[PDB]
Amino acid sequence: VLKGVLIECDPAMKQFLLYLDESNALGKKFIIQDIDDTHVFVIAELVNVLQERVGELMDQNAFSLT
């Protein structure tokens, strides 16, 4: 059995996380278990960098008016 964090979101973000896992963007393969098309299993020790990457992807194609 595994101990960690289940992450649920739209399939686009799941595919983005899979691309990050295969490209070693975070430096390792910590995206370990895939259970569903919209659910993934991730070790909680580095969830913060995943949030940072998601935020960077989100605000990259945003064109903030500030």
């Binding site: 059995v1 289940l6 259970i35 605000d59 008016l65």
Partner: protein
């Protein structure tokens, strides 16, 4: 919470004692729905109970849901009580005390709510309505600044303790000033009548600590609610505790009084609005806010969820950006509260349009709110070691019975449960194999 929710949990004796004051009965009647008011008026001049079916036939079949809701609310408020009509029938009759007080309030009779005002003659230091409004605004601004933590605003110790008990601000260490939490921000974003009502409800809840009569405080508050603006009332005729409570109202700006020993007190506009102005914010389709305000309180409130651009001596020009909204949400303020605050403070010019605010801006704010909650994270334990479907089904049923299940998938025989229930699930699984 609202008045009806607070009154629902009170004992029947407290509700009956509340109905002893005509002012309370009028407030309760006005808090009733539209359908309930007609029923109360029809049954006002009835000395005999009416059959339940006869009352139910007044409203059409299509609107029976509203009739049922009104009847349930009236029963919960104990305005009327079912009477055992002879022959096995059930009769509906209003509470005699409540009905008598309502008739006294409407038709007349008995003594006046206030003792007298002409016994002491005109007030030597009487003020005017604009002065009272300015005093109330200054008091409210001081209170809200003290909530923010500005050193310019200083209040009494018990008032600060009340905020701590309300959960708006927490005092981590003694001596150090408390820090405003997310609940404090939500309270700040609320409308002024809503803020006053919430503060009064918190005061009523905490009054049990001081051992003060809830009925007397509620009756006095309701009497102040219907009090005419600009007219003084006699301090005499009240218990010692209530006057002390009145002194707290003096700190809240609801009631203005020259001195503690003075026998005259003037209810303010805020006290009248407690029972229930034009708005000073103009919203443009280009995500720009134009506010006609000068006090630092409103400027800070707007800057909480917006980026400031210009501050003219009588104008504030700000821009609503994605980053500002995200920061405000991270501070704990939801998009619905922001929309409600903008609608409440909306300029009268914008009221001409069929929508108070443009749909595009509200939709954009709501979409920005959902950005933070787009990703769902659940810490837990995943079981994926099921050899047979039957074994998986039993463990899944046990987890559902325990209520610790997070996610289930019978197609792949994978489950995810909370870490707290992981020990219980493991113990159950071990017992099943060992006993087999």
């Amino acid at each position: 919470r609202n008045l009806q929710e607070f009154l629902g949990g009170l004992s029947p004796g407290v509700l009956d004692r509340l109905y002893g004051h005509p002012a309370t009965c009028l407030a309760v009647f006005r808090e009733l729905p539209s359908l309930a008011k007609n029923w109360v008026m029809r049954m006002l001049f009835l000395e005999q109970p009416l059959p339940q079916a006869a009352v139910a036939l007044w409203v059409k079949k299509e609107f029976s849901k509203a009739q049922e809701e009104s009847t349930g609310l009236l029963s919960g408020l104990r305005i009327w009580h079912t009477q055992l009509l002879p022959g096995g029938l059930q009769g509906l009759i209003l509470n005699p005390i409540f009905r008598q007080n309502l008739r006294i309030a409407l038709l007349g009779g008995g003594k006046a709510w206030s003792d007298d005002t002409s016994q002491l003659g005109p007030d030597k230091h009487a003020r005017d309505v604009p002065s009272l409004d300015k005093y109330a605004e200054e008091r409210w601004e001081v209170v809200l600044h003290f909530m923010v933590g500005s050193p310019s605003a200083a209040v009494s110790q018990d008032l600060a303790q009340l905020l701590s008990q309300a959960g708006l601000m927490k005092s981590t260490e003694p001596g150090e000033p408390p820090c405003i939490t997310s609940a404090g921000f939500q309270f700040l974003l609320l409308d002024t009548p809503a803020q006053l009502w919430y503060f009064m409800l918190q005061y009523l809840q905490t009054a049990q600590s001081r051992g003060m009569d809830l009925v007397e405080i509620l009756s006095f508050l309701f009497q102040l609610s219907f009090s005419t603006l600009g007219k003084d009332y006699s301090v005499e005729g009240m218990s010692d505790s209530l006057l002390n409570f009145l002194q707290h109202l003096r700190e809240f700006g609801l009631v203005f009084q020259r001195k503690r020993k003075s026998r005259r007190y003037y209810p303010t506009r805020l006290a009248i609005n407690l029972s229930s102005q034009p708005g000073f914010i103009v919203v443009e389709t280009n995500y720009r806010l134009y506010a006609y305000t000068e006090s630092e309180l409103q400027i800070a409130l707007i800057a909480l969820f917006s980026e400031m651009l210009y501050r003219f001596p009588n104008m504030v020009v700000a821009q609503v950006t994605r980053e500002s909204v995200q920061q405000a949400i991270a501070s704990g303020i939801t998009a619905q509260q922001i929309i409600h605050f903008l609608r409440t403070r909306a300029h009268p010019v914008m009221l001409k349009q069929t929508p108070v605010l443009p749909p595009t801006i509200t939709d954009q704010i709501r979409l920005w709110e959902l950005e933070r909650d787009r990703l769902r994270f659940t810490e837990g334990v995943l079981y994926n070691q099921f050899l047979s479907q039957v074994d998986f089904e039993l463990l899944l049923a046990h987890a559902r019975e325990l209520g610790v299940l997070v996610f289930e998938n019978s197609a792949k025989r994978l489950m995810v449960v909370t870490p707290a229930g992981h020990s219980d699930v493991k113990r159950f699984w071990k017992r099943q194999k060992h006993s087999s």
